[PDB]
Design a protein around this nucleic acid. Structure first.
Ligand SMILES: NC[C@@H]1O[C@H](O[C@H]2[C@@H](O)[C@H](O[C@@H]3[C@@H](O)[C@H](N)C[C@H](N)[C@H]3O[C@H]3O[C@H](CO)[C@@H](O)[C@H](O)[C@H]3N)O[C@@H]2CO)[C@H](N)[C@@H](O)[C@@H]1O
Ligand SMILES: [Mg+2]
Ligand SMILES: [Mg+2]
Ligand SMILES: [Mg+2]
Ligand SMILES: [Mg+2]
Ligand SMILES: [Mg+2]
Ligand SMILES: [Mg+2]
Ligand SMILES: [Mg+2]
Ligand SMILES: [Mg+2]
Ligand SMILES: [Mg+2]
Ligand SMILES: [Mg+2]
Ligand SMILES: [Mg+2]
Ligand SMILES: [Mg+2]
Ligand SMILES: [Mg+2]
Ligand SMILES: [Mg+2]
Ligand SMILES: [Mg+2]
Ligand SMILES: [Mg+2]
Ligand SMILES: [Mg+2]
Ligand SMILES: [Mg+2]
Ligand SMILES: [Mg+2]
Ligand SMILES: [Mg+2]
Ligand SMILES: [Mg+2]
Ligand SMILES: [Mg+2]
Ligand SMILES: [Mg+2]
Ligand SMILES: [Mg+2]
Ligand SMILES: [Mg+2]
Ligand SMILES: [Mg+2]
Ligand SMILES: [Mg+2]
Ligand SMILES: [Mg+2]
Ligand SMILES: [Mg+2]
Ligand SMILES: [Mg+2]
Ligand SMILES: [Mg+2]
Ligand SMILES: [Mg+2]
Ligand SMILES: [Mg+2]
Ligand SMILES: [Mg+2]
Ligand SMILES: [Mg+2]
Ligand SMILES: [Mg+2]
Ligand SMILES: [Mg+2]
Ligand SMILES: [Mg+2]
Ligand SMILES: [Mg+2]
Ligand SMILES: [Mg+2]
Ligand SMILES: [Mg+2]
Ligand SMILES: [Mg+2]
Ligand SMILES: [Mg+2]
Ligand SMILES: [Mg+2]
Ligand SMILES: [Mg+2]
Ligand SMILES: [Mg+2]
Ligand SMILES: [Mg+2]
Ligand SMILES: [Mg+2]
Ligand SMILES: [Mg+2]
Ligand SMILES: [Mg+2]
Ligand SMILES: [Mg+2]
Ligand SMILES: [Mg+2]
Ligand SMILES: [Mg+2]
Ligand SMILES: [Mg+2]
Ligand SMILES: [Mg+2]
Ligand SMILES: [Mg+2]
Ligand SMILES: [Mg+2]
Ligand SMILES: [Mg+2]
Ligand SMILES: [Mg+2]
Ligand SMILES: [Mg+2]
Ligand SMILES: [Mg+2]
Ligand SMILES: [Mg+2]
Ligand SMILES: [Mg+2]
Ligand SMILES: [Mg+2]
Ligand SMILES: [Mg+2]
Ligand SMILES: [Mg+2]
Ligand SMILES: [Mg+2]
Ligand SMILES: [Mg+2]
Ligand SMILES: [Mg+2]
Ligand SMILES: [Mg+2]
Ligand SMILES: [Mg+2]
Ligand SMILES: [Mg+2]
Ligand SMILES: [Mg+2]
Ligand SMILES: [Mg+2]
Ligand SMILES: [Mg+2]
Ligand SMILES: [Mg+2]
Ligand SMILES: [Mg+2]
Ligand SMILES: [Mg+2]
Ligand SMILES: [Mg+2]
Ligand SMILES: [Mg+2]
Ligand SMILES: [Mg+2]
Ligand SMILES: [Mg+2]
Ligand SMILES: [Mg+2]
Ligand SMILES: [Mg+2]
Ligand SMILES: [Mg+2]
Ligand SMILES: [Mg+2]
Ligand SMILES: [Mg+2]
Ligand SMILES: [Mg+2]
Ligand SMILES: [Mg+2]
Ligand SMILES: [Mg+2]
Ligand SMILES: [Mg+2]
Ligand SMILES: [Mg+2]
Ligand SMILES: [Mg+2]
Ligand SMILES: [Mg+2]
Ligand SMILES: [Mg+2]
Ligand SMILES: [Mg+2]
Ligand SMILES: [Mg+2]
Ligand SMILES: [Mg+2]
Ligand SMILES: [Mg+2]
Ligand SMILES: [Mg+2]
Ligand SMILES: [Mg+2]
Ligand SMILES: [Mg+2]
Ligand SMILES: [Mg+2]
Ligand SMILES: [Mg+2]
Ligand SMILES: [Mg+2]
Ligand SMILES: [Mg+2]
Ligand SMILES: [Mg+2]
Ligand SMILES: [Mg+2]
Ligand SMILES: [Mg+2]
Ligand SMILES: [Mg+2]
Ligand SMILES: [Mg+2]
Ligand SMILES: [Mg+2]
Ligand SMILES: [Mg+2]
Ligand SMILES: [Mg+2]
Ligand SMILES: [Mg+2]
Ligand SMILES: [Mg+2]
Ligand SMILES: [Mg+2]
Ligand SMILES: [Mg+2]
Ligand SMILES: [Mg+2]
Ligand SMILES: [Mg+2]
Ligand SMILES: [Mg+2]
Ligand SMILES: [Mg+2]
Ligand SMILES: [Mg+2]
Ligand SMILES: [Mg+2]
Ligand SMILES: [Mg+2]
Ligand SMILES: [Mg+2]
Ligand SMILES: [Mg+2]
Ligand SMILES: [Mg+2]
Ligand SMILES: [Mg+2]
Ligand SMILES: [Mg+2]
Ligand SMILES: [Mg+2]
Ligand SMILES: [Mg+2]
Ligand SMILES: [Mg+2]
Ligand SMILES: [Mg+2]
Ligand SMILES: [Mg+2]
Ligand SMILES: [Mg+2]
Ligand SMILES: [Mg+2]
Ligand SMILES: [Mg+2]
Ligand SMILES: [Mg+2]
Ligand SMILES: [Mg+2]
Ligand SMILES: [Mg+2]
Ligand SMILES: [Mg+2]
Ligand SMILES: [Mg+2]
Ligand SMILES: [Mg+2]
Ligand SMILES: [Mg+2]
Ligand SMILES: [Mg+2]
Ligand SMILES: [Mg+2]
Ligand SMILES: [Mg+2]
Ligand SMILES: [Mg+2]
Ligand SMILES: [Mg+2]
Ligand SMILES: [Mg+2]
Ligand SMILES: [Mg+2]
Ligand SMILES: [Mg+2]
Ligand SMILES: [Mg+2]
Ligand SMILES: [Mg+2]
Ligand SMILES: [Mg+2]
Ligand SMILES: [Mg+2]
Ligand SMILES: [Mg+2]
Ligand SMILES: [Mg+2]
Ligand SMILES: [Mg+2]
Ligand SMILES: [Mg+2]
Ligand SMILES: [Mg+2]
Ligand SMILES: [Mg+2]
Ligand SMILES: [Mg+2]
Ligand SMILES: [Mg+2]
Ligand SMILES: [Mg+2]
Ligand SMILES: [Mg+2]
Ligand SMILES: [Mg+2]
Ligand SMILES: [Mg+2]
Ligand SMILES: [Mg+2]
Ligand SMILES: [Mg+2]
Ligand SMILES: [Mg+2]
Ligand SMILES: [Mg+2]
Ligand SMILES: [Mg+2]
Ligand SMILES: [Mg+2]
Ligand SMILES: [Mg+2]
Ligand SMILES: [Mg+2]
Ligand SMILES: [Mg+2]
Ligand SMILES: [Mg+2]
Ligand SMILES: [Mg+2]
Ligand SMILES: [Mg+2]
Ligand SMILES: [Mg+2]
Ligand SMILES: [Mg+2]
Ligand SMILES: [Mg+2]
Ligand SMILES: [Mg+2]
Ligand SMILES: [Mg+2]
Ligand SMILES: [Mg+2]
Ligand SMILES: [Mg+2]
Ligand SMILES: [Mg+2]
Ligand SMILES: [Mg+2]
Ligand SMILES: [Mg+2]
Ligand SMILES: [Mg+2]
Ligand SMILES: [Mg+2]
Ligand SMILES: [Mg+2]
Ligand SMILES: [Mg+2]
Ligand SMILES: [Mg+2]
Ligand SMILES: [Mg+2]
Ligand SMILES: [Mg+2]
Ligand SMILES: [Mg+2]
Ligand SMILES: [Mg+2]
Ligand SMILES: [Mg+2]
Ligand SMILES: [Mg+2]
Ligand SMILES: [Mg+2]
Ligand SMILES: [Mg+2]
Ligand SMILES: [Mg+2]
Ligand SMILES: [Mg+2]
Ligand SMILES: [Mg+2]
Ligand SMILES: [Mg+2]
Ligand SMILES: [Mg+2]
Ligand SMILES: [Mg+2]
Ligand SMILES: [Mg+2]
Ligand SMILES: [Mg+2]
Ligand SMILES: [Mg+2]
Ligand SMILES: [Mg+2]
Ligand SMILES: [Mg+2]
Ligand SMILES: [Mg+2]
Ligand SMILES: [Mg+2]
Ligand SMILES: [Mg+2]
Lengths: 48, 275
RNA sequence: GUGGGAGAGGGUGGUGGAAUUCCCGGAGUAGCGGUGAAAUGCGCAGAUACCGGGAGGAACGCCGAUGGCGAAGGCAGCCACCUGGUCCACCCGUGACGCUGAGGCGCGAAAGCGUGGGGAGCAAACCGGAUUAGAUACCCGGGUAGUCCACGCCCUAAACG
RNA sequence: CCGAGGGUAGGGCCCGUGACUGGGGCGAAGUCGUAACAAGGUAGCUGUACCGGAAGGUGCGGCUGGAU
RNA sequence: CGCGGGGUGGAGCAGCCUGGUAGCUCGUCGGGCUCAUAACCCGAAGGUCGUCGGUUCAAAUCCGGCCCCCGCAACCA
RNA sequence: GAGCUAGCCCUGGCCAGGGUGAAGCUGGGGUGAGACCCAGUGGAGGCCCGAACCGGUGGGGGAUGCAAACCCCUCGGAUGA
RNA sequence: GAAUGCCGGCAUGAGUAACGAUAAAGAGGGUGAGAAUCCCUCUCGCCGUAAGCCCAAGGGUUCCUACGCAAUGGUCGUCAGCGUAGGGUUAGGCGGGACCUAAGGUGAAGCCGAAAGGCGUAGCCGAAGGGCAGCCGGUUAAUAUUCCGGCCCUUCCCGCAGGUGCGAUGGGGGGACGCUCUAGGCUAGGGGGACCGGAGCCAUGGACGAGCCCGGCCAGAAGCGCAGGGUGGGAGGUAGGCAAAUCCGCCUCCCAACAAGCUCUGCGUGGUGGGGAAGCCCGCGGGUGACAACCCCCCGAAGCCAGGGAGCCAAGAAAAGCCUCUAAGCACAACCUGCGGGAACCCGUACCGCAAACCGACACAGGUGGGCGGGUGCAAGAGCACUCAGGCGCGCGGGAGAACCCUCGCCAAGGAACUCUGCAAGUUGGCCCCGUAACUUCGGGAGAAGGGGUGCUCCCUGGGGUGAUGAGCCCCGGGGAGCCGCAGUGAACAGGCUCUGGCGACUGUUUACCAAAAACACAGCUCUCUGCGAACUCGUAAGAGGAGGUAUAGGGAGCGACGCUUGCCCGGUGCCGGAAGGUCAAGGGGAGGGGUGCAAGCCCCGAACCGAAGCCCCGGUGAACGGCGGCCGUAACUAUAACGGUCCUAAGGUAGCGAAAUUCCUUGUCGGGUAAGUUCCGACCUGCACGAAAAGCGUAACGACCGGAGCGCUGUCUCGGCGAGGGACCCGGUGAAAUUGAACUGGCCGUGAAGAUGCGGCCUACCCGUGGCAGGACGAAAAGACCCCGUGGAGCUUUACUGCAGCC
RNA sequence: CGAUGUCGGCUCGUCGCAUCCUGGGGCUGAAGAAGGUCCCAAGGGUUGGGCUGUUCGCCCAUUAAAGCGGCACGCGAGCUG
């Protein structure tokens, strides 16, 4: 059947993208905990 | 007249459509139409405010002159009569002698090619707009401004009409289509005559598809719901109300007058609607 | 054919007044209303009765008749438009073109039916009060369809001279 | 080939019959009321509509085959 | 068989915080009115209070035991 | 977190073929004019058969499965909500 | 030493199940240490509206080549989408950007919110929509509308020549639009040829032939031809298009109009540039064929002309490019036309792409949008059967031919006797014609039912299209005579039908993953609210929706097409109405009392009375919440009770229906069907416990709904038998799992916590496997979901308590 | 209750005797035939169908007879549902 994941690079970058987290105050805290933790990916890797 | 159909399908048995006899022009005027924003009951928050709306046919908003005092004294000629899907009424395309083309609601009896004129110097004949103080008492009107220079707000549906019952000081008394007697100012404009397409209420939709074409989504009964969705929901088996008939928000819907008693318009309303 | 005459003959569009009911204001108080007698009812929350104002619907007093018109059913304030029928005079024209009429077609009071409006009064069903052995009635107080309009059905009668 | 007839399938009309049901006709002395005949004690009859154990009552219109 | 309510004149019902009075309607009977019945008017009669115990000075009444009558309940499996 | 799903908005796309034969129109009949009737044309429909497509009725299989929803036979819709 | 403990390791099941669609393989040659699995050839099978080809999304080097096989590949492996290395993606014209705008997002102004932040006409962002200038071939191991070859085109800059009042973010036109049907002409595509070209072939009985086999085109600027789209020209006035306007709109008049002209597009021709098979040779391409031929006829699109036409209602985006108008401004400028020269950027371009490369943990029988999708036959068709081009034989095989299972085929006689039930499987099947009932809302029912025809050959003949009016080709027929077989939609693809009741009118929708229904929805009916800054809804607000709507409209509720109807109760509750009265908080008022101070004073209580909503109270209201009785007696046989009495209520169930989706007793009783009927149907009515919009009673049509019956036909059954394939079985390769206290694990009668392999007494039993069947191990699985317990939790309800939003 | 799957049907049987039939008997209100009752006996047999989920039961047509029970109301690691 049709599964939950139907990738779209357009949807990937406009939902979990860096500009998307920086607009909302909750997403700026996402990047704060993520830099503090030391993750190598601050946002999911997407190409175009 | 109302056009019916033979029962070749079960829906065509009761389905009725309008005669569309008064329509002379098929497509609207390009310089007067603009797109209509379809909401589907959604507000700026994206939430449904008014339940069961959406899925209608695509429409174009026809700019209707609900003022008519922009051009006082300048006569116009009824170039054509068209259909407006944003309302029950039919519209009249007006070619003024000034050169500007406009749209007004087409009143009953308005023939194509005759001349209309707005202003206090206008005669009393169908299609003409005058302030409520210059229209004679006892004549039926429509497109009535409720407050001066705010636009036509009264008697705009198909087949509706309001009658001047008298004058009292600076205001006039009007019998609205709900039967309500209200005191409206005399400088408020009104186009004389009743609105056309009086056979609009005689249209039987025939099937559920016609409601979906108009934008009317299926209405769910509260009894068919559950207790989290409605007060009438619940009960093993079919069950009655068990409480006074209420809306999904808690308020009763059988007799509850929801009008604000301290509204300042109560001082200008003589009698409430009856029947 | 010409020239006239009467008439609630029919359809449409307007319009006048009296009266009933309801609303608002004034003024006023201890009852009103109703019957054979009462009671329900309405009424100190100010009714009835009275004055003024407004809304709405229906029906047209006097004229009015032992009258008129229409084929019948039926038709009554008034104005106007459209229109049917009939009668008199002249003796002008056509020259039997006439009479009736199974079917057919049309009209057809009231009640009823569908869609929509309108609903003041009245009023089946219904409710109450009385009468009564009982009263699903007569009497009374309320009262919904209906009565009214537009369109479409119904086509019955003591549709009787 | 036609062909009496036989078979299959579906119709039409008529007759007999059927639990039960509907009104009807009739049968001296059963029961309930008293609608009509007199102004029959609410004048009657009528078409229609609604109601009521029942005759019937009431509304709308019509008739006199209604006395004073 | 588990809860609640009731058995009162020929019939239907009251009288029970109430201990001490048994009341209302219809019927029955006697007399009127009528030719006569019905209606109506006048005047009467009519009750072991289901039954047996107990409490009490005194039980239709208060409290138990059965005898009937009625209405609910008889659930999860 | 609406890339699954539910609804709505914007812009596009898709629905082989066959069958039934509404209104209207034309012609004739009918009438005082009509209503109406017949024939032809016409090609309407939450119309029919039926694929693609969207579903998921009944049964069988599958049950550490090909598959944390599948497969086979059969079945509903398929110009519309 | 235990916590269904945690982490790791290794066992057991066990050489067991499985090796992932039953589309299928066999032989020869080669490589190599090694080959069922790699390469080649031959034969066979499978797809062919795909299992072939192109594009988008996604993926991100998987592409190509060379050397390799430890691991990945369900086996093997010399092979590979695997490992190492190198190579490979070329654009002014294709897609995106330097153009436009939609929903939406953002957001100068502005508005709002403790803060964060939320709105917001303009503007900007935003695409698979609008706009936009390249087609054919060749080439590489791998890219090509990109490189090359041929022929075309666009924008920008500069120069020259001609022309004009030039000029914009502004005005106007245009862009600019639905659904269904459809005309004419072309094209894509396809079929045929007795014609043209071609390597060849004559087999096995026949054929040197109008023989078989193969192929018979693509693109192409300006011209020209054909077919279509768009569009009137002039003059005068002009107060509107937020300044201006010669443009546009409005008015008048003249010219002409199914045209013509102008412009634009498609198609054909077109200078010229390419391509070019079968076969045969050299080995996944190349050469030859070949100086290849490159014509004629027919079918004909859903694509093109296109912004075509017609009909219908549900009334069918915006903005820029483009044309025009003028404004500042400039008229040495600027714009247009033509010509010439120069300039032309960034990103993508490999490969998979219905799949071994995407989404499903797998090289997973699942899911995935668009375009092309040939031929023949079946009425048509994208269906179905075979088959072009192209791609595969699904990455374990070889044997055997047990039980059993799956999938399939057939069957005597019977024909539903099976069973909860004809569940399943049969029968029926397409087309043409004849014919067709109750009932009906007159459409329907209806494919009713039932029945005949269907192949081939020959003869005669009618109509249409293309041609021309004829031949030829193509389509649709009609009649007559024959032939064959068991059978003519000879295979494949295609309803079993009827009578009758319940429910819902219907098409639809729904529990993704146990329920598709009688539930939801629905047109339609009614009640109620709402006069617009509407009611209502979301939000603290601003603001939105409602609605750019205005009572023929909008919100809420119940009922649910239609037909006939929806009776009585307003006592309680809700709602609506009521300038009285009663109660009523803050506040006002302050008779009076108190504290303190020597005092003026200061301070604290405080009665009458005034004082809203609400409640009380008086009315109204049922398509508002709801409710619609009990006992006794009476008819001249009995029986029953039309009638009466009495008690209670606010009023005591009207019509219609009724053992019903409702009836406990109940398989009520009677009838029908049956040989027999707890079901079904028709009635009766003592309706435990129907009932009139939580509608009542009917109702044509419809239903993968639920009952009952009949015909047809059957392996459903009596009653089973046989046959096929895939497993099971054996052998080779790989090789799990839940489970498991240890185990050397018999029966019976007892006993034991009450159901013993393990205790007792007897009996029985050599050791160990393999295929099978499942009675036991209270077998496995899931700390019972039923039940209770816990002063555990959560969803829900209300006249439970308390509080909040909201409203008054 | 860290699970003993629950009615009935199907398939498969096995046992008990308080015996439905068949066999051997005693008494009889046993003439004969056929019954009634009781004793012995479990070796074999104990039908098909309509109704209902039904066990049971009623009914149809037979029969020598159409027995009653136990086996976790035997039997779902055999099936149905
Ligand atoms: N005549 C036939 C019909 O009779 C009806 O009436 C019938 C009954 O109503 C009527 O019953 C009557 C009754 O009215 C009257 N009050 C009492 C009388 N005993 C009865 O009489 C009836 O029954 C008895 C036996 O029972 C018979 O002997 C007698 O013949 C018969 N008429 O007797 C008639 C039957 O005979 C209607 N009156 C009438 O409309 C209609 O015509
Ligand atoms: Mg997916
Ligand atoms: Mg995942
Ligand atoms: Mg994308
Ligand atoms: Mg780093
Ligand atoms: Mg009209
Ligand atoms: Mg019609
Ligand atoms: Mg219908
Ligand atoms: Mg349009
Ligand atoms: Mg526009
Ligand atoms: Mg927004
Ligand atoms: Mg938002
Ligand atoms: Mg909505
Ligand atoms: Mg508009
Ligand atoms: Mg709808
Ligand atoms: Mg619309
Ligand atoms: Mg609904
Ligand atoms: Mg529910
Ligand atoms: Mg919720
Ligand atoms: Mg609730
Ligand atoms: Mg409820
Ligand atoms: Mg409720
Ligand atoms: Mg439930
Ligand atoms: Mg219920
Ligand atoms: Mg419910
Ligand atoms: Mg209710
Ligand atoms: Mg509430
Ligand atoms: Mg009124
Ligand atoms: Mg008079
Ligand atoms: Mg003369
Ligand atoms: Mg009449
Ligand atoms: Mg009438
Ligand atoms: Mg009384
Ligand atoms: Mg009255
Ligand atoms: Mg009525
Ligand atoms: Mg008369
Ligand atoms: Mg014959
Ligand atoms: Mg009388
Ligand atoms: Mg009398
Ligand atoms: Mg009388
Ligand atoms: Mg009655
Ligand atoms: Mg009456
Ligand atoms: Mg008369
Ligand atoms: Mg008389
Ligand atoms: Mg006496
Ligand atoms: Mg005498
Ligand atoms: Mg007497
Ligand atoms: Mg419970
Ligand atoms: Mg319970
Ligand atoms: Mg999420
Ligand atoms: Mg979505
Ligand atoms: Mg069609
Ligand atoms: Mg359809
Ligand atoms: Mg396709
Ligand atoms: Mg399925
Ligand atoms: Mg499963
Ligand atoms: Mg199907
Ligand atoms: Mg279909
Ligand atoms: Mg321990
Ligand atoms: Mg441990
Ligand atoms: Mg093991
Ligand atoms: Mg082995
Ligand atoms: Mg094993
Ligand atoms: Mg094995
Ligand atoms: Mg195996
Ligand atoms: Mg495989
Ligand atoms: Mg070899
Ligand atoms: Mg070698
Ligand atoms: Mg492939
Ligand atoms: Mg990947
Ligand atoms: Mg790699
Ligand atoms: Mg490769
Ligand atoms: Mg390897
Ligand atoms: Mg190896
Ligand atoms: Mg390997
Ligand atoms: Mg694998
Ligand atoms: Mg090697
Ligand atoms: Mg590699
Ligand atoms: Mg180029
Ligand atoms: Mg670009
Ligand atoms: Mg640039
Ligand atoms: Mg932009
Ligand atoms: Mg914002
Ligand atoms: Mg953006
Ligand atoms: Mg684009
Ligand atoms: Mg585009
Ligand atoms: Mg481009
Ligand atoms: Mg080449
Ligand atoms: Mg290239
Ligand atoms: Mg190319
Ligand atoms: Mg120029
Ligand atoms: Mg210019
Ligand atoms: Mg411009
Ligand atoms: Mg448009
Ligand atoms: Mg449309
Ligand atoms: Mg061609
Ligand atoms: Mg062809
Ligand atoms: Mg050819
Ligand atoms: Mg030979
Ligand atoms: Mg201007
Ligand atoms: Mg050309
Ligand atoms: Mg070649
Ligand atoms: Mg050569
Ligand atoms: Mg297409
Ligand atoms: Mg067009
Ligand atoms: Mg349409
Ligand atoms: Mg826009
Ligand atoms: Mg712009
Ligand atoms: Mg740049
Ligand atoms: Mg590329
Ligand atoms: Mg590809
Ligand atoms: Mg595809
Ligand atoms: Mg692949
Ligand atoms: Mg594989
Ligand atoms: Mg993978
Ligand atoms: Mg796959
Ligand atoms: Mg899908
Ligand atoms: Mg798909
Ligand atoms: Mg053939
Ligand atoms: Mg076919
Ligand atoms: Mg095609
Ligand atoms: Mg196929
Ligand atoms: Mg094949
Ligand atoms: Mg091939
Ligand atoms: Mg057989
Ligand atoms: Mg048979
Ligand atoms: Mg059945
Ligand atoms: Mg079946
Ligand atoms: Mg029949
Ligand atoms: Mg027919
Ligand atoms: Mg047939
Ligand atoms: Mg043959
Ligand atoms: Mg052609
Ligand atoms: Mg096949
Ligand atoms: Mg078939
Ligand atoms: Mg079929
Ligand atoms: Mg039934
Ligand atoms: Mg249905
Ligand atoms: Mg419905
Ligand atoms: Mg659905
Ligand atoms: Mg489900
Ligand atoms: Mg689930
Ligand atoms: Mg269904
Ligand atoms: Mg399902
Ligand atoms: Mg329901
Ligand atoms: Mg509706
Ligand atoms: Mg209805
Ligand atoms: Mg809210
Ligand atoms: Mg709006
Ligand atoms: Mg707008
Ligand atoms: Mg319902
Ligand atoms: Mg009612
Ligand atoms: Mg009634
Ligand atoms: Mg009643
Ligand atoms: Mg009553
Ligand atoms: Mg009440
Ligand atoms: Mg009340
Ligand atoms: Mg009251
Ligand atoms: Mg007072
Ligand atoms: Mg105070
Ligand atoms: Mg108050
Ligand atoms: Mg009550
Ligand atoms: Mg008696
Ligand atoms: Mg019954
Ligand atoms: Mg029964
Ligand atoms: Mg029963
Ligand atoms: Mg029962
Ligand atoms: Mg009876
Ligand atoms: Mg009865
Ligand atoms: Mg009941
Ligand atoms: Mg109700
Ligand atoms: Mg219903
Ligand atoms: Mg019902
Ligand atoms: Mg019914
Ligand atoms: Mg009917
Ligand atoms: Mg269904
Ligand atoms: Mg359906
Ligand atoms: Mg078998
Ligand atoms: Mg075989
Ligand atoms: Mg086999
Ligand atoms: Mg074997
Ligand atoms: Mg084996
Ligand atoms: Mg041992
Ligand atoms: Mg024991
Ligand atoms: Mg033991
Ligand atoms: Mg031991
Ligand atoms: Mg021992
Ligand atoms: Mg076992
Ligand atoms: Mg266990
Ligand atoms: Mg537990
Ligand atoms: Mg559960
Ligand atoms: Mg419990
Ligand atoms: Mg508990
Ligand atoms: Mg507690
Ligand atoms: Mg405790
Ligand atoms: Mg608790
Ligand atoms: Mg337990
Ligand atoms: Mg255990
Ligand atoms: Mg069996
Ligand atoms: Mg056995
Ligand atoms: Mg014995
Ligand atoms: Mg013996
Ligand atoms: Mg003997
Ligand atoms: Mg034995
Ligand atoms: Mg034995
Ligand atoms: Mg035995
Ligand atoms: Mg049974
Ligand atoms: Mg059965
Ligand atoms: Mg039983
Ligand atoms: Mg057990
Ligand atoms: Mg037991
Ligand atoms: Mg037991
Ligand atoms: Mg058992
Ligand atoms: Mg077992
Ligand atoms: Mg089981
Ligand atoms: Mg079982
Ligand atoms: Mg077991
Ligand atoms: Mg079940
Ligand atoms: Mg089942």
């Amino acid at each position: 059947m049709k599964r939950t994941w139907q990738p779209n690079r357009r949807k990937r970058a406009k939902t979990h993208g860096f500009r998307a987290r920086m607009r909302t105050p909750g997403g700026r805290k996402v990047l704060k905990r993520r830099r503090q933790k030391g993750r190598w990916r601050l946002t999911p890797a997407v190409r175009k | 007249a109302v056009k019916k159909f033979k029962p070749y399908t079960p829906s065509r048995r009761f389905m009725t459509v309008a005669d569309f006899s008064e329509i002379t022009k098929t497509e609207p005027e390009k310089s007067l139409v603009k797109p209509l924003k379809k909401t589907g009951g959604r507000n700026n928050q994206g939430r449904i405010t008014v339940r069961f709306r959406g899925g209608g046919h695509k429409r174009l908003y026809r700019i209707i002159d609900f003022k008519r005092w922009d051009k006082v004294g300048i006569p116009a000629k009824v170039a054509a009569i068209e259909y407006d899907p944003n309302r029950s009424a039919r519209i009249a395309l007006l070619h003024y002698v000034d050169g500007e083309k406009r749209y007004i609601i087409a009143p009953d009896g308005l023939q194509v090619g005759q001349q209309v004129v707005a202003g206090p110097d206008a005669p009393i004949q169908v299609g003409n707009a005058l302030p409520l103080r210059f229209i004679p008492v006892g004549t039926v009107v429509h497109a009535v401004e409720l407050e001066p220079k705010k636009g036509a707000k009264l008697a705009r549906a198909a087949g509706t009409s309001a009658q001047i019952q008298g004058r009292e000081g600076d205001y006039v008394i009007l019998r609205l289509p709900s039967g309500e007697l209200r005191k409206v100012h005399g400088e408020c404009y009104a186009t004389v005559g009743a609105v056309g397409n009086a056979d609009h209420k005689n249209i039987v939709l025939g099937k559920a598809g016609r409601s979906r074409w108009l934008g009317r989504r299926p209405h769910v009964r509260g009894a068919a719901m559950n207790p989290v969705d409605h007060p009438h929901g619940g009960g093993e088996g079919r069950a009655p109300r068990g409480r006074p008939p209420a809306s999904p928000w808690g308020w009763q819907t059988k007799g509850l007058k929801t009008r604000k008693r301290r509204k300042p318009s109560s001082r200008f309303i003589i009698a409430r609607r009856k029947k």
